[PDB]
Write an enzyme that holds these catalytic residues in place. Structure first.
Site, PDB file in Angstrom:
ATOM      1  N   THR A  99      -7.688  59.091  19.780  1.00  0.00           N
ATOM      2  CA  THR A  99      -7.503  60.071  18.899  1.00  0.00           C
ATOM      3  C   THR A  99      -6.633  61.185  19.268  1.00  0.00           C
ATOM      4  O   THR A  99      -5.845  61.486  18.478  1.00  0.00           O
ATOM      5  CB  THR A  99      -9.027  60.594  18.572  1.00  0.00           C
ATOM      6  OG1 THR A  99      -9.625  61.118  19.718  1.00  0.00           O
ATOM      7  CG2 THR A  99      -9.815  59.756  17.895  1.00  0.00           C
ATOM      8  N   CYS A 139     -17.087  65.613  14.626  1.00  0.00           N
ATOM      9  CA  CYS A 139     -16.517  65.436  15.822  1.00  0.00           C
ATOM     10  C   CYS A 139     -17.066  66.680  16.747  1.00  0.00           C
ATOM     11  O   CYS A 139     -16.837  67.823  16.273  1.00  0.00           O
ATOM     12  CB  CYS A 139     -15.165  65.445  15.941  1.00  0.00           C
ATOM     13  SG  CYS A 139     -14.510  65.407  17.622  1.00  0.00           S
ATOM     14  N   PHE A 184     -11.875  65.553  11.349  1.00  0.00           N
ATOM     15  CA  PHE A 184     -12.861  65.380  12.181  1.00  0.00           C
ATOM     16  C   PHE A 184     -14.094  65.175  11.791  1.00  0.00           C
ATOM     17  O   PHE A 184     -15.320  65.261  12.113  1.00  0.00           O
ATOM     18  CB  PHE A 184     -13.110  66.693  12.875  1.00  0.00           C
ATOM     19  CG  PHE A 184     -11.661  66.860  13.655  1.00  0.00           C
ATOM     20  CD1 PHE A 184     -11.516  66.494  15.001  1.00  0.00           C
ATOM     21  CD2 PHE A 184     -10.818  67.878  13.418  1.00  0.00           C
ATOM     22  CE1 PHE A 184     -10.379  66.785  15.752  1.00  0.00           C
ATOM     23  CE2 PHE A 184      -9.610  68.489  13.985  1.00  0.00           C
ATOM     24  CZ  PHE A 184      -9.332  67.692  15.184  1.00  0.00           C
TER      25      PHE A 184
END
Ligand code: HEM
Length: 440
Positions: A250, A382, A375
């Site tokens: 990512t 996240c 996110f």
């Protein structure tokens, strides 16, 4: 509700029979609009593309994170780590409560030196290239992020810049991740002891630690405030494997897409480079200097707007409910949030959605709630966000300080899909500005 082509008892499944399913889903979203149903043998889900419907989906009283099939396959090696666990699993809330403060922006001050350590290795590698050489961007960014997470995660050195065959753990992890995605009989033997290569190394390191403020240290010393229990050694191992899985590609992709957008937009590059030169006045950047890289941070957010590197997340309805006043859902019905489409919602961003304009993020609080979600969402968003952004900002800033870049092949964007997005084949040449790069 709209639905793409069905194929008998195959349903819509054959439509994902391609290397680039998300970009395929984006085209379907272009055709069918803000919501469409998508079926497979045994499965059904609804893809959402508009801020209008996605803001409702992000209501945690009504929807919770779903373990997609991809996450269930990854759970074979990520176990009940944060990324692959149900919100209602005891270990999720426990690891969440313990880890949250160690991932705060404040906590980044503690990881900064180790992040600098790896960042400097990347830059020196490039400083040391001869004129006839070029850079493989996503490949080097992946070396960087893997090594950074390994060092900040459990104070272990993969030494990826000393090799072109990765440390055996990386090879196993990468292999395992790839196998899990391909599932969506020698493969099975390989999978099992790639799992074993991963557990063996991580268990060993944890056991050695028994007899420095990194993450692992936090986890050995942490107690969940609700139960007063610490994490057990098995879960700690799963969390470590998890930081690597969720974080390495990512973050590597983000850095790669940002450099791509920069070389394709020389005016923005020049503005970003000017900030880096003004702000990073020392041979090694400080934590505070990184925080002053405002425009670099905007470049990164605009890269995440166009190509969020973890482009889809899954939710389920907690109870019977109606979505957007027109789509009844039953308890347990699934939704998929299609982030790249959300980020192209013209009613939020204007008509120029395809253009790379970091200035969009000049005033972040001007962005509507739930319009920008690279996110994820809520308590299941996240946990690595501050870590990812600090790393990317530090690294991009240093790149801009130390080199001019040339898109020497006139690279044609080719977006490869796995668990994440990457500009495959992206290469550049970097000519050094010959600026001192110092002792950490
Ligand atoms: C630009 C880089 C990154 C992006 C775009 C990203 C994106 C995401 C997204 C979308 C989710 C939600 C998944 C879902 O809802 O199913 C997630 C979860 C998670 N990520 Fe990140 N991630 C990044 C970097 C990192 C890093 C560096 C770490 C660790 C060092 C990390 C660790 C995690 C963890 C542990 C979860 C699960 C959190 C929970 O549910 O409690 N990520 N990430």
């Amino acid at each position: 509700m709209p639905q793409p082509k069905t194929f008998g008892e195959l349903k819509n499944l054959p439509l994902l029979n391609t290397d680039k399913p998300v970009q395929a889903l984006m085209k379907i979203a272009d055709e069918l609009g803000e919501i469409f149903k998508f079926e497979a043998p045994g499965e059904v889900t609804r893809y959402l593309s508009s801020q209008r419907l996605i803001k409702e989906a992000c209501d945690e009283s009504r929807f919770d994170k779903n373990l997609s099939q991809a996450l269930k396959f990854v759970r074979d090696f990520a176990g009940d780590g944060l990324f692959t666990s149900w919100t209602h699993e005891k270990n999720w809330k426990k690891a969440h409560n313990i880890l949250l403060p160690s991932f705060s922006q404040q906590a980044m001050k503690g990881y900064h030196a180790m992040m600098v350590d790896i960042a400097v290795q990347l830059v020196q590698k490039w400083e040391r290239l001869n004129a006839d050489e070029h850079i493989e961007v996503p490949e080097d960014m992946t070396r960087l992020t893997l090594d950074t997470i390994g060092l900040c995660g459990f104070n272990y050195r993969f030494n990826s810049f000393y090799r072109d065959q990765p440390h055996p753990f990386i090879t196993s992890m990468v292999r395992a991740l790839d196998e899990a995605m391909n599932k969506l009989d020698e493969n099975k033997r390989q999978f099992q002891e790639d799992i074993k290569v991963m557990n063996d190394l991580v268990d060993k390191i944890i056991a050695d630690r028994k007899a420095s403020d990194d993450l692992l240290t936090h986890m050995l010393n942490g107690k969940d405030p609700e139960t007063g229990e610490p994490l057990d050694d098995e879960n700690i191992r799963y969390q470590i494997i998890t930081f690597l899985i969720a974080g390495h590609e990512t973050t590597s992709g983000l850095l790669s897409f940002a450099l791509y957008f920069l070389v394709k937009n020389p005016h923005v590059l020049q503005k970003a480079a000017e900030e880096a030169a003004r702000v990073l006045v020392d041979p090694v950047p400080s934590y505070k200097q990184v925080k002053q890289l405002k425009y670099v941070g905007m470049v990164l957010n605009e890269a995440l707007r166009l190509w969020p590197t973890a482009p889809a997340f899954s939710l389920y309805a907690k109870e019977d409910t109606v979505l957007g006043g027109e789509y009844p859902l039953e308890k347990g019905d699934e939704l998929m949030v299609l982030i790249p489409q959300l980020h192209r919602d013209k009613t939020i961003w204007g008509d120029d959605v395809e253009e790379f304009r970091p200035e969009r993020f000049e005033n972040p609080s001007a962005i509507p709630q739930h319009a920008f979600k690279p996110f994820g969402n809520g308590q299941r968003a996240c946990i690595g966000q501050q870590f990812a952004l600090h790393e990317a900002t530090l690294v991009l800033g240093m790149m801009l300080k130390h080199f001019d870049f040339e898109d020497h092949t006139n690279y044609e964007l080719d977006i490869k899909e796995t668990l994440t997005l990457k500009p495959e084949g992206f290469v550049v040449k970097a000519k050094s500005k010959k600026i001192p790069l110092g002792g950490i």
